[PDB]
Amino acid sequence: MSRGSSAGFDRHITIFSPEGRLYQVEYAFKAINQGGLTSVAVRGKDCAVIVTQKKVPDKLLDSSTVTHLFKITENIGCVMTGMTADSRSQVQRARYEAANWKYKYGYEIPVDMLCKRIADISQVYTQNAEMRPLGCCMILIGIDEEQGPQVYKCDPAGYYCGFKATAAGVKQTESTSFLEKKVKKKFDWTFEQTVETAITCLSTVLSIDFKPSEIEVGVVTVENPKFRILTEAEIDAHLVALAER
Amino acid sequence: MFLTRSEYDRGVNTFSPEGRLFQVEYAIEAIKLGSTAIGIQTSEGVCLAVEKRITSPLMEPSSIEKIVEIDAHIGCAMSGLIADAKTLIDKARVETQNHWFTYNETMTVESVTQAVSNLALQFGEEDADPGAMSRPFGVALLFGGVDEKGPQLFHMDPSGTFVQCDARAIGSASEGAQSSLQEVYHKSMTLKEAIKSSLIILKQVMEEKLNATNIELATVQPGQNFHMFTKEELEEVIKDI
Amino acid sequence: PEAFTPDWESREVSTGTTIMAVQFDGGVVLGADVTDKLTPIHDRIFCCRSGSAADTQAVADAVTYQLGFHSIELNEPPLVHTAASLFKEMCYRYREDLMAGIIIAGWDPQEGGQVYSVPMGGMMVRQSFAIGGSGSSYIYGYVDATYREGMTKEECLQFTANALALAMERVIRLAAIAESGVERQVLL
Amino acid sequence: STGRLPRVVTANRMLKQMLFRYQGYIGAALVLGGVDVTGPHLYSIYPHGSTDKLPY
Amino acid sequence: PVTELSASGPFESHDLLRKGFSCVKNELLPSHPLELSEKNFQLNQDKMNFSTLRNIQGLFAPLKLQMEFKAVQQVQRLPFLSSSNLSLDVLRGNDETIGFEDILNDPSQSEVMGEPHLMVEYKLGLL
Amino acid sequence: GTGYDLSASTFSPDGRVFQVEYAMKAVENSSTAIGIRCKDGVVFGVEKLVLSKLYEEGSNKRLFNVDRHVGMAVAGLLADARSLADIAREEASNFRSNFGYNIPLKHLADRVAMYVHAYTLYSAVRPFGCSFMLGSYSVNDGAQLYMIDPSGVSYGYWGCAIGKARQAAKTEIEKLQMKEMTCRDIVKEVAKIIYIVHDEVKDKAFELELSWVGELTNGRHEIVPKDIREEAEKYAKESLK
Amino acid sequence: MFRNQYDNDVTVWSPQGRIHQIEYAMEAVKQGSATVGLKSKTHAVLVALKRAQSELAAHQKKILHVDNHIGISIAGLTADARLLCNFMRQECLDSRFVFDRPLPVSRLVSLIGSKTQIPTQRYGRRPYGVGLLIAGYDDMGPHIFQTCPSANYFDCRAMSIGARSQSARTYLERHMSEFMECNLNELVKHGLRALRETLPAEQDLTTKNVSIGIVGKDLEFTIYDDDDVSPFLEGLEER
Amino acid sequence: VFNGGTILAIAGEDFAIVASDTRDSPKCYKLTDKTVIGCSGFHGDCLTLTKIIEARLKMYKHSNNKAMTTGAIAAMLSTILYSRRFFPYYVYNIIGGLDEEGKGAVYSFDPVGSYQRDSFKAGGSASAMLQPLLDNQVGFKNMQNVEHVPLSLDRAMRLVKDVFISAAERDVYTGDALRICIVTKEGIREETVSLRK
Amino acid sequence: NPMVTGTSVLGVKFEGGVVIAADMLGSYGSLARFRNISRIMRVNNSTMLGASGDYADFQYLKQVLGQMVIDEELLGDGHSYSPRAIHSWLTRAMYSRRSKMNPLWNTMVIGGYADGESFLGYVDMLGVAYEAPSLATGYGAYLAQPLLREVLEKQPVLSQTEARDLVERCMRVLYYRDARSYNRFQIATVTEKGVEIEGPLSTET
Amino acid sequence: MALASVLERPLPVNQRGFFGLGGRADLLDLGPGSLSDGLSLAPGIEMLHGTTTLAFKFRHGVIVAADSRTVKKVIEINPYLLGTMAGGAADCSFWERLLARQCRIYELRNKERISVAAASKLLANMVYQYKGMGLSMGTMICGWDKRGPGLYYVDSEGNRISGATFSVGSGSVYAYGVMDRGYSYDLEVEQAYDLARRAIYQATYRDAYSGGAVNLYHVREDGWIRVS
Incomplete structure (x- = not known):
């Protein structure tokens, strides 16, 4: 471990392969699936919703400490997918960078600027031989000022992009197809319709009827811009309202 | 099962599965490529005899001296890598002068040896104090001096570690010369007989013959300073056979 | 043996904004005297600034930065003690390089209204009331005379208005910080 | 980078922190003013790094 | 009156032709109040940021920032040629701000530069 | 994952950092520690193995006091565990110095876990081969129990077991209705569980190391007093047969 | 055999969860010569066996003085023992300077x-x-x-x-x-x-x-x- | 400035004396079994200086495998004092003890480290007034004796007591249990005797 | 900076401990607004501390010194800072900070009882330290100093009640001299029992 | 720990005792009586001072002479090199002890003795580094090397003058006068003149403080001697 670079086309981060591919970055992308959890983020007319699986495979484990939805700033929340410690460390970095932005520029960081900053750091990790990517994906949500709801997805390669709906985790492709089909039809989902869309995507690509304790939901709204994590009663209300229909 | 290659010696900082660091023992083997230096500590003084091994008749012998002076009461005998030896010699010299400046007295033989050892044991660990050495010094020294505790002889090897001695041989024939010093030495022998034994053993272990040009003798006595024997003094001592 | 001490407040004042802050039951009423002199550090934690404007605003910006960051880390509304601690750190480290005296007043769930006072030289002492800046002459005696130790929001507003008004008689913009939020009020 | 037209508070922060960095040795006293999505904002920055948000 | 003459041991050696004109007599009171504030500004800003990270988040945060800074500053250009500090600026946050260090007295055109080997082996701590 | 497992900065072709996995197996190398959170406190207990009869009782402790209110039970390399105890003590003291009150246990767990993670990131340092549990009690917070593992993942637990026999001990903890027990009955059950999962033949001659923090100590971490530990050991022995 | 990739560095975890350079360093300790430490209610003594190549050399200095109340006996590499002894001596000096009292062992x-x-x-x-x-x-x-x-x-x-x-x-x-x-x-x-x-x-x-x-x-x-050592060795019954 | 300090050091043939009048400045602290120092200056500098000397004595003993002689302590103290030459220690030092011959030795220092060996030396405010009288009193002649006063130890003790009595026509004259440190071949001997007031 | 005197802090040894007084007052200059503040710290069971001077530095040293005490509490190895250890640490700290400018303007009276031997020490911001059977730092230092020294010369051995009454008389004389309301004074005592501090006792003429 | 060590700052945050913009910072500044003694490289207003000195070169050496006696007026740098005192006593003694340390290190390295030009130049450099900081030196370096007798006046103000007659002190004006000399004076006649010149200082004084005989000197080829 001490020092040096491992020889091989897929064994160091700063080695290209004959086809110009950085394979350690792609292996980090596979590290996102380490955990077996899928996240869905859906942008609506006036709200953004992040929904993630909450697997607690231990009777002895205090379930209120298991969470993947984090609060970056007062008005930005994220769902982290991937390796758990890497997720928590990237949340810590995003928190610091957002505080610095507010310090320097006098106003609170936007969502796109936060994912851009995190992706700049991630690019620096991919280019240098001492560091490694983080095996995690960040999906950020917020209400901007004059654009509206925002869902952004940073990734281990340093790439980021805004979306109308996005997924990360094991069922990222299945969820992306589901949300593409939903968004082609109509997109101005009010607030309930976005929550139903996110929950239905998660519960369809996993073919699982959810319980309020197998799912986490964090939301922002234009009228309530602050990141909020729904209680189990609220998620259960949404699930029963989806089941009755 | 199978025999496989295991290598624990190609880098410093690596213990073998035996508790043993091989790059330091390879530096001791580096000593065994030097010329033989014999140091005998008696109660009348300490003698230092070294084999010079002049390579060409065109070379100034005064420039290949294996016995140097650290201070008026200490002299060193060298064997091994010369470039490293002179670094340790200069450390000893500057340390003695620092001690004189600060405390207005002569540094004892053991204290000089300890300062040189503090310098010599600081290898490996290169990215901690740049300008450090990064490998063991490939030189063994023989500090022979006279101080408050009478004549004293010390030995330092590619470890930065010193032990006091009474008769040492270092160099390429240190095993045979040490086996000879084993019997020829007795704890109360005169300095003339110490020089005698040193030169007899040097004659035994040299591939050439004793002339006053291919060896080098120095002595440090309680009253007299460090003294390097001259061409005529050496001639007389060897014609004593 | 005489333990001579720097005064820290007779260095360079020559002036004063005559800041003040009084603790009532479940809140504080800062009060001060077209510009504004009540810097909101957090949603229910304000401060009043004495000294040089530049240095005090630098310290207030740094505390706002650090308090927001710490509040996000620990996932709780910040304590007023925490804001006062951050202010004390910078107002005591940079004691010789800044002209900055601070009164921190606010509200937090587990302690209520709090008037931690950080004078020049850097010093937290929680107080039932705190006054500052050219006002240790007229205001201090009258407030020591009358404080009632337990006022309500309205009586505290009237009391602070009276004190700052007699500082005038030597606008009055006030802010009451309860659990329900800040109710800023401008007088003249 | 942001793709948004700036904010007056951003300019005020940059000015006040730069003027605070140079400890009043840059003699720029300014009357900053602009208009963002937030509304009209008028500031007055002083050479030592102290601002003041004002109506006039 | 600075005291500190290591003078216990003022045995240090200097290169006379390379020391230029040094005046320790006046190297105790900066020439301007802003001289050191500007010389050590990125240093002091890093120390301020590491201090707030330490106090709010923990030992890990300054350690990781310092470790990233150390890593990027090490795949660089040999000191006698100007570097861009592209990755270091992205890490520190200077990729989108221009200060006065960036426009005044440009490092890329130094007006004076030493010998290659002397400048490399000074960075290596060899003098 | 051979070929991709010599550095903590290398990903396996399936997104696995294997040095961190080997560090967690390193935790599995050592004897077991369990921690049970009850209705009014937390109780730690370590199957401490007697290396020799020559060691003064209390040496090689694995139940540290990290702060006045926090106690730490470790497994894995003991040198790593002591270094992490030092780090946790530094974090708690720094928080108290800055902010003037006792550090919340969740925040302490985050700080130390993020340190451990920071070691799982570089080629210059190796992951910690040690796992540990933190446990506190405050009147305004209740009992709290956290476990950090070498990857930097800290969760909150109702009962945890780290070490060689974590799986058997976890099976034995699940039978306890710890959410409605006091610290005394939990101490007896902790001793029982330590005695059950001890492997009497492979390992030999262990000694219990019990500790609590609760309201019976007024939110102060302590060693279980000698008499209560004797009662717990007697209960544990009599239950084994 | 399957051990060669994981035992050359102290920063590599073996897939069995073992650092091997640590264990090899422990062997380095075993390569010294025996030293004994024991204590009574009032004294703590250190006894060491010296090797001197069996003739013509002053023996190793195996017991070192750290402070007026601390002394150490070494087994293993001598350079490391000297580095650690310098550390111990400096820490004892620092304690006496700052706090005026002997540093606790x-x-x-x-x-x-x-x-x-x-x-x-x-x-x-x-x-x-x-x-x-x-x-x-x-x-x-x-x-x-x-x-x-x-x-x-x-x-x-x-x-x-x-x-x-x-x-x-x-x-x-x-x-x-x-x-x-x-x-x-x-x-x-x-x-x-x-x-x-x-x-x-x-x-x-x-x-x-x-x-x-x-x-x-x-x-x-x-x-x-x-x-x-003669007063101590005179009274030692034969083996 | 900063009165109350009067150090009288006398080196004999086989003894050394360092006598001080306590007033708050207590001193004549012992360095080795052959050396006594006497600091007459600002108290804080004296404390720090004696702590530094103790640390350096321990480091010397560890490096050199012997306790450090009187002349070596003097030379080291001279370099320690000159270390702060542009910000000096405000101390006036006198080192008294035995040399390696066994004879007496007394060294006196500036605040910046200038030292010379003396046969006796009075140091402080009262030193100027006491010095001529004890000088022409101790010598009894003009013969040099550049390193040893001819008197015996009891006679030198008597001279020290008599000269401090004669100080009663001088400055503060503490009368505060006169501190006296005696260095002989049998070790240091602190013998604080009270000047009767 | 203009200099003002520190608030008075007294202390006398006796047979079985040390008693310390320190009247509550923020300052005599412009910080007299800040009242009802205690200048006495309890370091550990065998040590206490009365400080006169800048309250910012007293607060800083309370932080540092209490954290050192907690640090030893955690190890539980059977060693605790003795009063002399704390006194020497404070002397080193104040000399170090005096030299490396960064001032620490606080004058302290360290009292303690360890091993059946009472300790009373003095440290000021310059690094001056010593030990006396009675001390007085602050406003009426040179007015209370002769009083204490003469009383101790008359009777070198005191008891709790005698020592406390003597400290009462010193503080009263410092009250009759100057009209500052010494309603605000604390008395502290370290004994074999420990450091026991009673709060703001009030003089009623 | 290993990470902070790989970083090699050391900076007061990656350590222990940090609780703000600094705090105790591993000992609130408190440290040790040094980490390194000497034998290695590593407010008192009452410093001491000097009075009267000569020195001339020769045909047979260089001759120092000082105003009698006690106190010291000529520093004995080493067997082959001399130096006088003026200004601060500690300054002269310390800086020429450092010069003798340099001279001995040179002799050990190079196996020949340092020249007087080199020695005076080393001293001039050492005291020129701290020019304007209050050093007060008035030394006068004299010796004998492969170039013959050498005589230099080295000053704390950067001066380093070579010359065949120098004089420092109060009676300097009367002692430089009375210096009617010749480069080929006999040795006895040279001792005569230096005696007479320090005398023509003190023909207005007599034996006493900085008074006595002449503390004469003589730098021969094989090292100096003390004539009387």
Whole structure:
């Protein structure tokens, strides 16, 4: 471990392969699936919703400490997918960078600027031989000022992009197809319709009827811009309202 | 099962599965490529005899001296890598002068040896104090001096570690010369007989013959300073056979 | 043996904004005297600034930065003690390089209204009331005379208005910080 | 980078922190003013790094 | 009156032709109040940021920032040629701000530069 | 994952950092520690193995006091565990110095876990081969129990077991209705569980190391007093047969 | 055989969860010569066996003086022992300077533990190949501590480290029930008999190969060597 | 400035004396079994200086395997004092003790480290007034004796007591249990005797 | 900076401990607004501390010194800072900070009881330290100093009640001299029992 | 720990005792009586001072002479090199002890003795580094090397003058006068003149403080001697 670079086309981060591919970055992308959890983020007319699986495979484990939805700033929340410690460390970095932005520029960081900053750091990790990517994906949500709801997805390669709906985790492709089909039809989902869309995507690509304790939901709204994590009663209300229909 | 290659010696900082660091023992083997230096500590003084091994008749012998002076009461005998030896010699010299400046007295033989050892044991660990050495010094020294505790002889090897001695041989024939010093030495022998034994053993272990040009003798006595024997003094001592 | 001490407040004042802050039951009423002199550090934690404007605003910006960051880390509304601690750190480290005296007043769930006072030289002492800046002459005696130790929001507003008004008689913009939020009020 | 037209508070922060960095040795006293999505904002920055948000 | 003459041991050696004109007599009171504030500004800003990270988040945060800074500053250009500090600026946050260090007295055109080997082996701590 | 497992900065072709996995197996190398959170406190207990009869009782402790209110039970390399105890003590003291009150246990767990993670990131340092549990009690917070593992993942637990026999001990903890027990009955059950999962033949001659923090100590971490530990050991022995 | 990739560096975890350079450093400790430490209710003595190539050399300096109340006996690499002794001496000086009181032995040993733990995690370093037997005396009585290349330290009633020290430890385990009420003379004799147990049946303890260091309630740390050990060796019954 | 300090050091043939009048400045602290120092200056500098000297004595003993002689302590103290030459210690030092011959030795220092060996030396405010009288009193002649006063130890003790009595026509004259440190071949001997007031 | 005197802090040894007084007052200059503040710290069971001077530095040293006490509490190895250890640490700290400018303007009276031997020490911001059977720092230092020294010369051995009454008389004389309301004074005592501090006792003429 | 060590700052945050913009910072500044003694490289207003000195070169050497006696007026740098005192006593003694340290290191390295030009130049450099900081030196370096007798006046103000007659002090004006000399004076005649010149200082004084005989000197080829 001490020092040096491992020889091989897929064994160091700063080695290209004959086809110009950085394979350690792609292996980090596979590290996102380490955990077996899928996240869905859906942008609506006036709200953004992040929904993630909450697997607690231990009777002895205090379930209120298991969470993947984090609060970056007062008005930005994220769902982290991937390796758990890497997720928590990237949340810590995003928190610091957002505080610095507010310090320097006098106003609170936007969502796109936060994912851009995190992706700049991630690019620096991919280019240098001492560091490694983080095996995690960040999906950020917020209400901007004059654009509206925002869902952004940073990734281990340093790439980021805004979306109308996005997924990360094991069922990222299945969820992306589901949300593409939903968004082609109509997109101005009010607030309930976005929550139903996110929950239905998660519960369809996993073919699982959810319980309020197998799912986490964090939301922002234009009228309530602050990141909020729904209680189990609220998620259960949404699930029963989806089941009755 | 199978025999496989295991290598624990190609880098410093690596213990073998035996508790043993091989790059330091390879530096001791580096000593065994030097010329033989014999140091005998008696109660009348300490003698230092070294084999010079002049390579060409065109070379100034005064420039290949294996016995140097650290201070008026200490002299060193060298064997091994010369470039490293002179670094340790200069450390000893500057340390003695620092001690004189600060405390207005002569540094004892053991204290000089300890300062040189503090310098010599600081290898490996290169990215901690740049300008450090990064490998063991490939030189063994023989500090022979006279101080408050009478004549004293010390030995330092590619470890930065010193032990006091009474008769040492270092160099390429240190095993045979040490086996000879084993019997020829007795704890109360005169300095003339110490020089005698040193030169007899040097004659035994040299591939050439004793002339006053291919060896080098120095002595440090309680009253007299460090003294390097001259061409005529050496001639007389060897014609004593 | 005489333990001579720097005064820290007779260095360079020559002036004063005559800041003040009084603790009532479940809140504080800062009060001060077209510009504004009540810097909101957090949603229910304000401060009043004495000294040089530049240095005090630098310290207030740094505390706002650090308090927001710490509040996000620990996932709780910040304590007023925490804001006062951050202010004390910078107002005591940079004691010789800044002209900055601070009164921190606010509200937090587990302690209520709090008037931690950080004078020049850097010093937290929680107080039932705190006054500052050219006002240790007229205001201090009258407030020591009358404080009632337990006022309500309205009586505290009237009391602070009276004190700052007699500082005038030597606008009055006030802010009451309860659990329900800040109710800023401008007088003249 | 942001793709948004700036904010007056951003300019005020940059000015006040730069003027605070140079400890009043840059003699720029300014009357900053602009208009963002937030509304009209008028500031007055002083050479030592102290601002003041004002109506006039 | 600075005291500190290591003078216990003022045995240090200097290169006379390379020391230029040094005046320790006046190297105790900066020439301007802003001289050191500007010389050590990125240093002091890093120390301020590491201090707030330490106090709010923990030992890990300054350690990781310092470790990233150390890593990027090490795949660089040999000191006698100007570097861009592209990755270091992205890490520190200077990729989108221009200060006065960036426009005044440009490092890329130094007006004076030493010998290659002397400048490399000074960075290596060899003098 | 051979070929991709010599550095903590290398990903396996399936997104696995294997040095961190080997560090967690390193935790599995050592004897077991369990921690049970009850209705009014937390109780730690370590199957401490007697290396020799020559060691003064209390040496090689694995139940540290990290702060006045926090106690730490470790497994894995003991040198790593002591270094992490030092780090946790530094974090708690720094928080108290800055902010003037006792550090919340969740925040302490985050700080130390993020340190451990920071070691799982570089080629210059190796992951910690040690796992540990933190446990506190405050009147305004209740009992709290956290476990950090070498990857930097800290969760909150109702009962945890780290070490060689974590799986058997976890099976034995699940039978306890710890959410409605006091610290005394939990101490007896902790001793029982330590005695059950001890492997009497492979390992030999262990000694219990019990500790609590609760309201019976007024939110102060302590060693279980000698008499209560004797009662717990007697209960544990009599239950084994 | 499957071990070669994972034992060349102290920064590599073997897929069995083992650092192997640490264990090799522990072997480096076993390559010294036996030294014994034991304590009574009032004294803490350190007994060491010296090698001098059996003739023509002053023996190794195996017991070192750290402070007036702390002394150490070394087994393993000498350079590491000197580095650690310099560290211990500097820390004792710092304690006397700042706090005016003798540094507690347990605190010193904890500092050694941290100092020697750092090389076992970092790149470009190797563990310390020396093991120490630290004998101290402070407010809490006599102390015997054993420090290891792994950066572990142990509070001992008695301990032997070095080459063929298992025999000394067997003796000390057999006889430790009477160490506490022993006076200085027979405590040093107990240590001497253990050190003798680390020898062939023919060889015997002499003044030339035995070094002793006592600290105690009244004593400061003193080292007895080459002729000062005679009072202690005269009364030692044959094997 | 900063009165109350009067150090009288006298080196005999086989003894040294360092006598001080306590007033708050207590001193004449012992360095080795052959050396006594006497600091007459600002108290804080004296404390720090004696702590530094103790630390350096311990470091010397560890490096050199012997306790450091009187002349070596003097030379080291001279370099320690000159270390702060542009910000000096405000101390006036006198080192008294035995040399390696066994004879007496007394060294006196500036605040910046200038030292010379003396046969006797009075140091402080009262030193100027006491010096001529004890000088022409101790010598009894003009013969040099550049390193040893001819008197015996009891006679030198009597001279020290008599000269401090004669100080009663001088400055503060503490009368505060006159501190007296005696260095002989049998070790240091602090013998604080009270000047009767 | 203009200099003002520190608030008075007294202390006398006796047979079985040390008693310390320190009247509550923020300052005599412009910080007299800040009242009802205690200048006495309890370091540990055998040590206490009365400080006169800048309250910012007293607060800083309370932080540092209490954290050192907690640090030893955690190890539980049987060693605690003695009163002399704390006194020497404070002397080193104040000399170090005096030299490396970064001032620490606080004058302290360290009292303690360890091993059946009472300790009373003095440290000021310059690094001056010593030990006396009675001390007085602050406003009426040179007015209370002769009083205490003469009383101790008359009777070198005191008891709790005698020592406390003597300290009462000193503080009263410092009250009759100057009209500052010494309603605000604390008395502290370290004994074999420990450091026991009673709060703001009030003089009623 | 290993990470902070790989970083090699050391900076007061990656350590222990940090609780703000600094705090105790591993000992609130408190440290040790040094980490390194000497034998290695590593407010008192009452410093001491000097009075009257000569020195001339020769045909047979260089001759120092000082105003009698006690106090010291000529520093004995080493057997082959001399130096006088003026200004601060500590300054002259310390800086020429450092010069003798340099001279001995040179002799050990190069196996020949340092020249007077080199020695005076080393001293001039050492005291020129701290020019304007209050050093007060008035030394006068004299010796004998492969170039013959050498005589230099080295000053704390950067001066380093070579010359065959120098004089420092109060009676300097009367002592430089009375210096009616010749480069080929006999040795006895040279001792005569230096005696007479320090005398023509003190023909207005007599034996006493900085008074006595002439503390004469003589730098021969094989090292100096003390004539009387």
